[PDB]
Amino acid sequence: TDLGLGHNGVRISLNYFDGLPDPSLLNSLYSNELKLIFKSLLKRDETTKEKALMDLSNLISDFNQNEYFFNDIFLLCWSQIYAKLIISDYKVIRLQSHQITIMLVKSLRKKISKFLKDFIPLILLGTCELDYSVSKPSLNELTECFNKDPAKINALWAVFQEQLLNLVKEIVVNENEDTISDERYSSKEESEFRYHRVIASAVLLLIKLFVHNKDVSERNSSSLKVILSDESIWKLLNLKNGQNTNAYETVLRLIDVLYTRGYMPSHKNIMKLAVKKLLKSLTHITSKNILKVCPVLPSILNLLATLDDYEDGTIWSYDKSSKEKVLKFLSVSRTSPSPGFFNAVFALYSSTKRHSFLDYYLEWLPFWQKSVQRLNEKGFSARNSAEVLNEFWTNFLKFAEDSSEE
Ligand SMILES: [K+]
Numbered sequence: 030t031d032l033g034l035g036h037n038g039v040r041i042s043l044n045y046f047d048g049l050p051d052p053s054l055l056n057s058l059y060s061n062e063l064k065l066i067f068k069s070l071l072k073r074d075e076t077t078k079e080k081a082l083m084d085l086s087n088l089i090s091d092f093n094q095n096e097y098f099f100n101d102i103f104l105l106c107w108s109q110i111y112a113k114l115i116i117s118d119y120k121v122i123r124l125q126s127h128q129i130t131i132m133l134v135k136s137l138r139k140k141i142s143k144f145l146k147d148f149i150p151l152i153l154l155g156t157c158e159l160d161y162s163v164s165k166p167s168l169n170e171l172t173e174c175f176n177k178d179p180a181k182i183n184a185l186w187a188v189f190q191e192q193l194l195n196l197v198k199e200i201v202v203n204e205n206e207d208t209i210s211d212e213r214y215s216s217k218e219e220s221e222f223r224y225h226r227v228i229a230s231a232v233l234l235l236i237k238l239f240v241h242n243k244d245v246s247e248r249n250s251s252s253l254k255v256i257l258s259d260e261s262i263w264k265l266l267n268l269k270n271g272q273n274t275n276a277y278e279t280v281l282r283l284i285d286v287l288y289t290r291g292y293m294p295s296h297k298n299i300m301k302l303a304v305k306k307l308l309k310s311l312t313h314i315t316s317k318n319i320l321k322v323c324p325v326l327p328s329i330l331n332l333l334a335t336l337d338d339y340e341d342g343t344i345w346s347y348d349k350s351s352k353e354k355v356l357k358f359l360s361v362s363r364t365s366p367s368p369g370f371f372n373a374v375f376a377l378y379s380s381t382k383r384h385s386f387l388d389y390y391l392e393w394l395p396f397w398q399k400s401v402q403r404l405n406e407k408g409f410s411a412r413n414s415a416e417v418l419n420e421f422w423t424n425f426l427k428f429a430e431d432s433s434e435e
Contacts, residue, residue, distance in 0.1 A: 034112060034192075034199060036146040039105050041112045043199060043227070044208040048113070050106045057102050062088075070110050075119055082114075082125040089129060092136040099137065107133075108147045115151055116209060116227050118219065120163050127155040127163075131170045149189045150196040157233040159226070159275045186241030193238055194249050194256075200231040201261045225265070229276040230281055232262055241284045246292050255286075257299045263306040268313050274325045277310075281328050286333060295399060304336065304344045308351055311358040320362050323365040330362070330373035337380040345386065352386065361401045368420065371400070375424040382431070389435045397425050 033048060035041035043046030050067065058064050062084075069081035075272060088095050107130075114126035130148050134141055141148075155167040175181035186193070208222035233258070239245055246253065256262070262283070265276040284303050287293050293300045311329070314322050335357070336344045345351045362370070378393060387393055401421060408414035 033198060033203075034150065035108065036192075037105060037108065037143055039109055039146060041109055043112055043116060043204050045113070045211045046208070048109055050109050053234060054102065056104060056205060059098050059100055059102065063098060063103060067106060067110070069369060070114070074313055075122070076285065079119070079121055079125070082122065082129065086132070088124055088127050089132050091416065099133065104133075104141065104144050108144055109273065111148070112151060115155060116223060118223060120160065123155070123158075124166060127152065127167045131167070131174050135174045144211055146192045148262070149185055150192045153185065153189075153193065153237075154230050154234055157230045157237065159229050159279065177236065183241060186238060190238065190242060190245065191249060194245075194252050197231045197235050197238075198252055198256055200228055201256050201259050205261075225276060228261055229265060229279055230266065231302060232265065232276075232279050236279070236283050236286055239290055239292075243290075244376060246290070246295070254296070254299070257296075257300070263302065266306050266310040268310070268322060270318070274322060276323050278328055281307075281325070281332050285332055285335060288339070294339065300339075300344070300346050301417060304347050307332070311354055314358060314361055316361060317366065319361060319365045323367055324363045326365065327367065327369035327373040329358075330370070330377050334373065334376040334380045337350075337377070337383075337386075342381060342384045342386060356387070356392065359396055363396060364403065365381055366417055366421075368416055370417070371421045371424045378428060389431065392416065393428070397421075397428060401425070 030040070032038070032040045033042040035048075039051075039054075040048045046166040049071070055064060055067055058067065066081045066085050068187065069077045070085075072078060088098060092099070111126055111130055113124050117123050117126070130152060134145070134148060134152075152167070152171060156164050156168070156171060158164040204224075206220045210223045212220070215223070262280065265280045268274075270276070284293075284307065287299070287303075293303075305328075348354070359374070374396075381387065382389075404414070404418055404421060408418060
């Protein structure tokens with residue numbers, strides 16, 4: 030039978046309706062004290078649940094006295110609920126759950142070896158949470174767990190490659206908003222937010238997987254394909270009035286890593302899927318939300334410049350009206366500039382001129398002209414006006430040296 034994320038005979042999953050501890054298994058736990066704890070963890074009341082974890086976290090602190098409590102039965106059961114606690118909408122629950130597991134790995138080093146394939150992927154997923162207040166404490170705990178040995182952590186991304194990729198597949202492909210959140214106790218909005226947060230983590234975890242591994246594309250190609258072919262990751266490229274741009278930026282990073290590692294030239298279909306969704310995205314950037322999108326504008330421009338290098342700007346052909354789409358994006362983006370912005374524009378210019386994407390005098394020059402005009406009116410009110418202005422003139426002066434050629 031398919032055990033999902035499990036490797037010790039029981040099913041581990043992120044959804045709410047399977048992968049739960051067997052009542053007869055729970056009743057085999059060493060102590061009645063553990064049974065009450067697990068009984069409260071399986072309840073919804075956040076208060077009693079938060080208290081259950083606290084009790085559990087303390088039992089593990091005084092591990093020497095309660096070593097027999099944390100036997101194979103305990104680990105089996107825990108491995109199943111842990112996967113569910115780390116998607117709790119209360120970060121308190123998520124923090125403690127990650128802490129407990131990391132503690133067990135430390136207090137049980139060689140006696141927990143069977144379960145590393147079931148714990149390490151979820152531990153690392155915790156370190157990949159966009160919320161720094163969750164990911165950083167998890168990383169400090171994990172780091173300490175291996176005595177601050179850097180190579181000992183880097184080894185994890187290699188050793189547990191397959192399981193990590195399986196966890197991503199689980200999140201992106203096998204699960205969705207409605208299986209991750211129970212509609213009985215969650216509104217559509219909370220479910221959207223819950224999935225958003227989890228899949229965002231999975232993208233960052235996927236990024237780190239590419240960074241730490243050169244031969245990631247070769248070993249698990251088939252699985253990488255079903256992950257990157259799904260519509261779930263690329264859905265994070267949708268701006269929303271309530272959401273911030275952290276997930277958006279994460280996807281931009283993914284596209285960048287996939288291209289630099291040469292995965293994109295090897296999979297033209299995933300290329301066209303990412304570029305198309307990225308171009309659709311630009312059209313949703315308007316004056317209404319420009320202040321919100323402001324901090325990613327340089328990243329967008331920098332990404333488009335990198336992708337333009339691919340076979341003399343072939344990506345633009347994936348949509349005949351892309352030249353027009355870039356035009357409306359540049360015209361809007363210059364109404365909310367920031368450090369790095371004009372640097373990235375020049376990057377875009379420098380690359381795209383190699384096939385004369387946009388007219389030098391009719392489209393490029395008016396852009397630079399209207400930019401400085403706004404800068405002079407707004408500034409020098411706030412920062413980083415000074416930096417931004419200097420950056421503009423530096424890039425514009427380089428742009429201006431090609432005027433002779435036309
Ligand atoms: K999905």
